[PDB]
Amino acid sequence: APVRSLNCTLRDSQQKSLVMSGPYELKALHLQGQDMEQQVVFSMSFVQGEESNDKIPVALGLKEKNLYLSCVLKDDKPTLQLESVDPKNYPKKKMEKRFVWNKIEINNKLEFESAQFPNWYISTSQAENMPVFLGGTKGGQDITDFTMQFVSS
Secondary structure: OOEEEEEEEEEEEOEEEEEOOOOOEEEEEEHHHHHHOOOOOOOEEOOOOOOOOOEEEEEEEEOOOOEEEEEEEEEOOEEEEEEEOOOOOOOOOOHHHHHHHEEEEEOOEEEEEOOOOOOOEEEOOOOOOEEOOEOOOOOOOEEEOEEEEEEOO
């Protein structure tokens, strides 16, 4: 296939799952049992970009939905957002830069750094049911590490 993709779910280091809040927002919360099915399933695409043995550029879209995680400036600050795209032109090998994330493998966890804004990462709050956001700090009060689960697709 032109661009290779795989379906997966993500959980932060505190074992919180991700779910859709509104139509353009994601939230993280401790989930278990039946409610598990509420979690978002991502379609991770391996796109073009600077690559390393521990740094792989990917695009993160929602499975079967023309919605992708994007980074844009808002109030002079990098911000995370869910963006709608033409369902016929995506995904594609050469994604616009705002859609690109550097998937970094550390300890045994994963971090997702904005390709557009160096050292800004997809983060979650320690608190329950808060929005997923773009944070510019590591080893702080916010969580930037995740684990990934592959789903049968």
